[PDB]
Amino acid sequence: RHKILHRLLQ
Amino acid sequence: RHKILHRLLQ
Amino acid sequence: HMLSDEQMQIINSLVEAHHKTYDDSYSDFVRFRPPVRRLSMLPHLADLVSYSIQKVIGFAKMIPGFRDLTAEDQIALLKSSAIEIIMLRSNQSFSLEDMSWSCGGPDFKYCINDVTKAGHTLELLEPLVKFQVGLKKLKLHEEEHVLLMAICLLSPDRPGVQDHVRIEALQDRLCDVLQAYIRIQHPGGRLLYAKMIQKLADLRSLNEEHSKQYRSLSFQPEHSMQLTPLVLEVFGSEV
Amino acid sequence: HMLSDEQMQIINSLVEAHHKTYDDSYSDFVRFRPPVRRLSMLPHLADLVSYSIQKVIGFAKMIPGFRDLTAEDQIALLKSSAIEIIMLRSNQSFSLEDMSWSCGGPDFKYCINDVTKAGHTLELLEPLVKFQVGLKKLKLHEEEHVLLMAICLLSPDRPGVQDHVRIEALQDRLCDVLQAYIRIQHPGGRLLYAKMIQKLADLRSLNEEHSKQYRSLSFQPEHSMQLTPLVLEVFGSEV
Numbered sequence: 001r002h003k004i005l006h007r008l009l010q
Numbered sequence: 011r012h013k014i015l016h017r018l019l020q
Numbered sequence: 021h022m023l024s025d026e027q028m029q030i031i032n033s034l035v036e037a038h039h040k041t042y043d044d045s046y047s048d049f050v051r052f053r054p055p056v057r058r059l060s061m062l063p064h065l066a067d068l069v070s071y072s073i074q075k076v077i078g079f080a081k082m083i084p085g086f087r088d089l090t091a092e093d094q095i096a097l098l099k100s101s102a103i104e105i106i107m108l109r110s111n112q113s114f115s116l117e118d119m120s121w122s123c124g125g126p127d128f129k130y131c132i133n134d135v136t137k138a139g140h141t142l143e144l145l146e147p148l149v150k151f152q153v154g155l156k157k158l159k160l161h162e163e164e165h166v167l168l169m170a171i172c173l174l175s176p177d178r179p180g181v182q183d184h185v186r187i188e189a190l191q192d193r194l195c196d197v198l199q200a201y202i203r204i205q206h207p208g209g210r211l212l213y214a215k216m217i218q219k220l221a222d223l224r225s226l227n228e229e230h231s232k233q234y235r236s237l238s239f240q241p242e243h244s245m246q247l248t249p250l251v252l253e254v255f256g257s258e259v
Numbered sequence: 260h261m262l263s264d265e266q267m268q269i270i271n272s273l274v275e276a277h278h279k280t281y282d283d284s285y286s287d288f289v290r291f292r293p294p295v296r297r298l299s300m301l302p303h304l305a306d307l308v309s310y311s312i313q314k315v316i317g318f319a320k321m322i323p324g325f326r327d328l329t330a331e332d333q334i335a336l337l338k339s340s341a342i343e344i345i346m347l348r349s350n351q352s353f354s355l356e357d358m359s360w361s362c363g364g365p366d367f368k369y370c371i372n373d374v375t376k377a378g379h380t381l382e383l384l385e386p387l388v389k390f391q392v393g394l395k396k397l398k399l400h401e402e403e404h405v406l407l408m409a410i411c412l413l414s415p416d417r418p419g420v421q422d423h424v425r426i427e428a429l430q431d432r433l434c435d436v437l438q439a440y441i442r443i444q445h446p447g448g449r450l451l452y453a454k455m456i457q458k459l460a461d462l463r464s465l466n467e468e469h470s471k472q473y474r475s476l477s478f479q480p481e482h483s484m485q486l487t488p489l490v491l492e493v494f495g496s497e498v
């Protein structure tokens with residue numbers, strides 16, 4: 001669930 | 011499950 | 021009257037974030053799949069949009085307060101508003117003359133002509149350009165333009181948002197500065213703030229239209245395979 | 260002795276399929292995200308590979324018999340062998356001289372130099388080139404080269420294959436022609452067939468290595484977001 005969004009959000 | 015592979019396989 | 025340091029700090033924080041996430045040389049565009057003048061523009065535009073999401077995300081992470089929201093709320097805000105932030109940030113390259121988006125030059129000059137072969141119809145392009153033109157006319161300051169993007173992104177009335185109250189605070193502390201700045205630093209900006217908020221409402225309709233059209237396109241794998249992982253994930257329906 | 264019409268028909272069917280799915284002008288490469296000499300080659304190579312999958316699929320759909328297998332079996336065969344078919348088809352552009360892949364010219368000439376910044380290591384590149392060189396030396400005929408691709412793709416010993424028996428028949432009727440052709444039409448090809456089958460075994464190790472390295476790369480979203488929907492789906496682990 002939203003793998004890339006997460007990694008980008010940190 | 012393999013949306014694009016299917017569409018391409020027909 | 022005049023603004024306070026706290027407010028001035030917010031503006032410098034945003035303006036900087038925008039500068040840091042918006043390349044005026046548009047030299048990154050050379051790395052997109054080449055533009056081509058049947059949905060011949062989809063590859064290049066998909067890349068442009070994916071790239072823009074990455075910038076919009078980078079902008080958010082710098083909006084003061086945003087980074088303290090829950091990872092879940094951050095996503096909910098991005099997924100629902102990214103498409104609007106992109107329409108807002110893209111205005112900085114929209115030209116009233118040629119009525120297009122000029123990004124560094126030819127090949128990257130998207131007239132209503134080439135923008136058609138990307139899978140979208142006039143049912144979106146018409147209101148879109150209408151929006152870009154209207155907005156371009158408000159000759160906003162960088163400060164106001166960047167505020168409007170942070171306000172739009174911090175709307176607590178987006179589906180999926182949990183803390184629809186702490187985000188209410190943030191957006192409010194944001195609308196304050198905008199209202200203030202326009203009062204203290206914008207001659208003839210008495211009816212501006214109201215015109216801007218109206219734009220945020222127009223972005224809601226455009227968002228709706230893009231969503232419908234994106235679904236139809238995205239449902240056809242021969243087309244969805246042209247998109248990028250980020251575009252698929254962000255504009256996807258995963259809860 | 261000599262081959263039969265049925266066999267000759269199979270060869271013309273394959274050779275044609277290869278011609279129809281392999282552009283000798285490599286003019287489609289201009290549409291890939293530009294090559295760039297930190298994983299600077301990943302975008303361009305990802306596009307090249309995705310594009311290749313599309314060709315490998317198009318080739319399969321024309322291998323006689325393949326189209327009658329179950330949609331499920333067709334996928335199982337592609338997902339497990341696509342990477343090997345790509346290594347096999349890519350040999351047609353591998354050059355012993357410069358020890359690289361020359362596709363239409365510069366920018367599309369991938370030396371072991373640029374092929375490094377795509378996320379893979381020597382633990383793959385070494386055996387790979389070794390393979391390309393060895394294979395390039397068997398100076399196969401188009402007929403034999405295309406047969407080997409159809410044989411490799413119709414291996415019933417791939418995970419996920421249901422009808423591991425009807426596919427056994429097809430691959431067998433395929434190895435027959437190869438054995439025959441080499442006997443009837445290839446001077447000095449007494450020890451060829453055996454050398455070829457050995458290549459199919461090497462493709463198994465390369466497949467294994469690529470799989471390991473692909474997993475590590477694909478696990479890092481900053482990298483997997485560089486791939487394409489097709490590459491992700493085909494090299495993915497979805498059952």
Ligand SMILES: CCCc1cc(C(O)(CC)CC)ccc1-c1cc(OCc2ccc(CO)c(CO)c2)ccc1CC
Nearest residue numbers: 065066069072107109110111112113121135138140234
């Ligand atoms: C709001 C519509 C966004 C959009 C979405 C899609 C998809 O839905 C997802 C990929 C298709 C499935 C395809 C094309 C488009 C598009 C991009 C444009 O770029 C302006 C361009 C974009 C961004 C910036 C900065 O982020 C600048 C510079 O200011 C210029 C102009 C016009 C259009 C509609 C056809």
Ligand SMILES: CCCc1cc(C(O)(CC)CC)ccc1-c1cc(OCc2ccc(CO)c(CO)c2)ccc1CC
Nearest residue numbers: 304305308311346348349350351352360374377379473
């Ligand atoms: C077998 C390895 C396939 C491969 C996979 C990946 C990924 O796993 C998936 C995207 C990375 C996550 C990235 C790069 C590569 C690659 C491609 C090459 O192209 C030959 C090139 C490819 C195809 C054809 C025809 O299909 C020709 C023309 O004959 C030339 C040469 C060398 C390499 C290893 C670095």
